[PDB]
Amino acid sequence: EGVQAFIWQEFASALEVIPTTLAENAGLNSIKVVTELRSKHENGELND
């Protein structure tokens, strides 16, 4: 907790630019691709 919490939060948001572009270039719905990847990773899947 502190002033650096938002900086680390935006650091995590900017790190996901790679898979957002793969869904964009492949014509897939990106927002959907990144909402399912959170769901699969929370179930213990390290690689998805």
Next chain:
Amino acid sequence: DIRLVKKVGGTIDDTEMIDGVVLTQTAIKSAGGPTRKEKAKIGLIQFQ
């Protein structure tokens, strides 16, 4: 230590592995010397 020889012409499928070293230079053929010779020992002339 890796060598890539650039050449115009041919197709992409023509690229293949060569077990030995390949010379990018060509023969002179001014006096009409041979172009093919078997069981030859290659000597490196470092003088003129």
Next chain:
Amino acid sequence: VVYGGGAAEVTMSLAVSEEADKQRGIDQYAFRGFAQALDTIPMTLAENSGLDPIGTLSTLKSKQLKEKISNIGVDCLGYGSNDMKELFVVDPFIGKKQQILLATQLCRMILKIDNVIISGK
């Protein structure tokens, strides 16, 4: 009438945020963008008044979520109390409403432009 000065903005920002996770769908990011867009006004008042936007924004979000009283905003003149009952500040409802209506209705037109032809004079 209403009570502006960052109190109406943070009150209207958390109202759409509390409904965003209830109505996830696909437009939840638009609700969050509308929430963060309303927060720029009290952060601008905090920026011009010199106060910290972190402590100011965190205090309004944490306090307004706890207490239901919705007349606390950004004190720019540097008073010790942020309650606007004592500071003598009042705004009209028709005035604060038109800020959102004319803004959200214009930006629909701004976003719908694809071809942009400008004839040089």
Next chain:
Amino acid sequence: HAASQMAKPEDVKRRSYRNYGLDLIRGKIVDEIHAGVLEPTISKVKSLKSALEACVAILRIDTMITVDPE
């Protein structure tokens, strides 16, 4: 040509069709063997491959960048 490809293996006449086609002088369908129209197999081999790589080189281009000369 279609009536030839679909056909039974055992059908001489139809199979022959696989062999002939367009004529530019008289304007009718005649046999290439009697007419004498013939090409090598090597002429078609590596011709579509060169056209394929030619299509791949331009088709994969999205944006164009031009630098003016100094």
Next chain:
Amino acid sequence: MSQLFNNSRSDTLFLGGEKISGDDIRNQNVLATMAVANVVKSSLGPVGLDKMLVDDIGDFTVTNDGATILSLLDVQHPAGKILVELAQQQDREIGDGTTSVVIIASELLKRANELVKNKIHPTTIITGFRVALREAIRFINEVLSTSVDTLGKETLINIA
């Protein structure tokens, strides 16, 4: 087909010429291909007829070959230089089909650009051509014919 030239952009400052993107590039590349494909389209086959090109000194060259007519046509566009050098690669290797290989490539870029406008990716389009060409060469092997029961040099005469 492209009109209303792209605006000079202030947010993206690159030295030299201006950058342009979108579907106008593949439209301009196909338009550059039709500039050379229509030249060689008329001089195909026995019924085809050729044209003349002057050398700006009184001399000229009446050319039937695709490599020669494109060699004198110095194409300033980048996409056209690929087909110009392809014909110089074609005539040196095989010496045949120089007009057809340019016409095949022009028709491919026509329909490939139409397929990109139909919202399928070029990577799937290229994969469709490669699996199709691999079956085409397999089909070319099926329709071969060995010269047999021919009197003398007749097979070499009529093929010439």
Next chain:
Amino acid sequence: ASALLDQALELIQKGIHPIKIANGFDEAAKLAISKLEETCDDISASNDELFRDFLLRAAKTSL
């Protein structure tokens, strides 16, 4: 208006249609003004004396 455009850009980049973005603000704007109307206080019940003072509270704001 610029704040809505700045937040809408991030979104366009992540990947959403622009008219669908404006549809989200419309449902959010009507819900925002509807919630402000719920927590709105009326000063018409007071007499003219207290209502005289309320004009000073708003006139001093804009001035």
Next chain:
Amino acid sequence: PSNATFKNKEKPQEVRKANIIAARSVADAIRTSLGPKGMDKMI
């Protein structure tokens, strides 16, 4: 409040904004060249 530090300078944050937009402009030029679905760039 009135005792807060104004810092006297808005030119630094404006120059940083001009650099970020200039850096994001060329970064968005090559965004579509990533992955198997990327496209070539002839210069």
Next chain:
Amino acid sequence: KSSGRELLERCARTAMSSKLIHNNADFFVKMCVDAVLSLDRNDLDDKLIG
């Protein structure tokens, strides 16, 4: 044997797509439907809708 008032509202809803109105069409479609119904059916004029 449906009602005549709902016919104009049903067909005018298609016209308000691809515009800035499509979300505010619940309120403005009643305006144009009630506006044109005031006109005479025999003599429908285009200059009276300025």
